[PDB]
Amino acid sequence: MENFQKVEKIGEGTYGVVYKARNKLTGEVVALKKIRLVPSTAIREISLLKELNHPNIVKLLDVIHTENKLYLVFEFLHQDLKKFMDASALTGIPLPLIKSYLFQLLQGLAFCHSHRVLHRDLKPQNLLINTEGAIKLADFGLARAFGVVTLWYRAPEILLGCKYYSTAVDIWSLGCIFAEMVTRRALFPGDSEIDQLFRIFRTLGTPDEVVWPGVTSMPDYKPSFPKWARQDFSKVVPPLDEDGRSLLSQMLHYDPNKRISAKAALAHPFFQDVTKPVPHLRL
Ligand SMILES: NS(=O)(=O)c1ccc(N/N=C2\C(=O)Nc3ccc4[nH]nnc4c32)cc1
User: Fold this and answer.
1) Is the CB of 144 under 6 A from ligand 1?
2) Is 14 annotated as ligand-binding?
3) 9 and 134 together in one domain
4) Which of the residues bear the PTM N-acetylmethionine?
5) CATH code at position 33
6) How far apart are alpha carbons 118 and 176 in whole angstroms?
7) 8-state DSSP, 115
8) Is 69 annotated as a binding residue?
9) Do 73 and 59 contact (CB within 8 A), yes or no?
10) CB distance 10 to ligand 1 below 6 Å
11) Euclidean distance between CA atoms 165 and 155, whole angstroms
């Protein structure tokens, strides 16, 4: 760690504090994450993530295991989607830019999912943007490598106690983020696990055996859950057009098996006119 000069704290992530730092020998500017606790399985799993490169994935440059402490060295980007959405709150992110960002994030998910790597904790704070119009997902695979607080983007199967969740959890989180970019407000801002679950039910309807076979047998499912009627997406994400609402509805299906995959979502008619605009970034 003597090879790195810390510039400033970037933030406090799920698995540790992130710092902007300079590599003293190469002059490289990086993001350094100090993992808060090292287990041998975690080292091997993290080491496999170093081989996982894609233009829409934040590069894991190095794993440093020293003095019983673990540091992850990553590619640095200048802004996260949270700060960008806050800066764009008065005017809204232009629809062509939301579409480009959604398309790129789906390419990133499709890539990780093809390698059986899941994120599990997607949120605006771990989506990073640059001046070229790119957006990249940070922290893929860390949840599985380390094991085990914003609940807003959590898939209903996780909230209902499914232990063996799938790649569909990331599609759910990304659907939530897509809605938030469009409306400029969080879709499901729950402040407890039950409030998160009930906010989902009040919008999409309380799930039942018809829409989600096996739901009633889930570990945390209670027959005493109130039964709310589903709402129209036209009320949920105005002024998003029919193509966007159709795609979003597929990303927010209750049954993880019915939920659209990243690969199938890339083929959705919503992306027929996708482009790559340049955002106005104030750094
Ligand atoms: N709020 S803000 O716009 O001023 C702002 C600016 C830069 C950053 N960068 N973050 C990270 C980075 O560059 N690489 C990684 C890799 C893994 C991570 N996990 N969590 N974060 C990261 C980051 C985040 C927020």
Assistant:
1) no
2) yes
3) no
4) 1
5) 3.30.200.20
6) 17
7) T
8) no
9) no
10) yes
11) 9
